[PDB]
């Protein structure tokens, strides 16, 4: 019977690193692991990656996610079984052959800056966690992280941040804000925010 936690945010919010911090203090036995929505990231036709190559697509929209996979997987978690998940490359907008392979758990943590807006999804999470960070520390991050580890140009990055991030994030991602139990600002960060998160587990567990 795994426990789901979902966690979701923008950006660059610290998302990841806020489950990190969960399961280094879950530490100090419960087997955990740390899922990605970005994982799931639909597998994209010839003219839509034509576009995004271009910088025309639009990577923050509800509809860029396997929202079907994804349902899909995480109910099989939720029903004990051993799943696959899918590895994407950002570089090429593609989906690898290479698949990875996800055993049961006791806590599955599922961060992605979208993992509320479907509500099917939604209802998996026991627990969910919205990650709040200033906006300008985000973006910053943002553009380091895509000049290195994704390989791209800091005028096109700003440029898709101006066109789709923002607009995106304050449509779709922030309204599911009001869904989470506990919204984490300065993410990883808060340790007092994320202890008693984590005392909150355990006392579940
Ligand atoms: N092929 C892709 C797919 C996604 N993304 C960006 O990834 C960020 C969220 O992880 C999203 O903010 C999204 O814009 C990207 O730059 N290129």
Same mark, same amino acid.
């Given at each position: +019977?795994?426990? =789901? ?19 280094? =203090? ?8 740390? =899922?990605?929505?970005?994982? /799931?990231?639909? @597998? ?8 995004? *190559? &271009? ?16 349902? &899909?997987?995480?109910? +099989? #978690?939720?029903?004990?079984?051993? @799943? ?6 950002? @570089? ?15 806590? !599955?943590?599922?961060?992605? #800056? ?16 919205? @990650? ?11 553009? =380091? ?8 140009? *800091? +005028? ?12 995106? /994030?304050?449509? /779709? ?10 919204? %984490? ?8 925010? %994320?202890?008693? #998160? !984590?005392?909150?587990?355990?006392? #579940?567990?």
């Amino acid at each position: +019977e795994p426990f =789901l936690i979902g966690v979701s945010g923008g950006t660059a919010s610290g998302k990841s690193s806020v489950c990190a911090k969960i399961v280094q =203090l879950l530490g100090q036995q419960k087997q955990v692991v740390i =899922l990605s929505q970005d994982s /799931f990231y639909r @597998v994209l036709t010839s003219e839509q990656k034509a576009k995004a *190559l &271009k910088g025309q697509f639009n990577f923050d929209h509800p509809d860029a996610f396997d929202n079907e996979l994804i349902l &899909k997987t995480l109910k +099989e #978690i939720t029903e004990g079984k051993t @799943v696959q998940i899918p590895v994407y490359d950002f @570089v090429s907008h593609s989906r690898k052959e290479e698949t990875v392979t996800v055993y049961p758990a006791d806590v !599955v943590l599922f961060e992605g #800056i979208l993992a509320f807006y479907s509500q099917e999804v939604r209802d998996l999470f026991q627990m969910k966690l919205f @990650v709040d960070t200033d906006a300008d520390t985000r973006l910053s991050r943002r553009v =380091l992280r895509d000049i290195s580890e994704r390989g791209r140009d *800091l +005028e096109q990055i700003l440029s898709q941040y101006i066109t789709f991030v923002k607009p995106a /994030f304050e449509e /779709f991602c922030l309204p599911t804000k009001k869904y989470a139990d506990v919204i %984490i600002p300065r993410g990883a960060d808060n340790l007092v925010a %994320i202890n008693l #998160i !984590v005392q909150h587990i355990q006392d #579940i567990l």
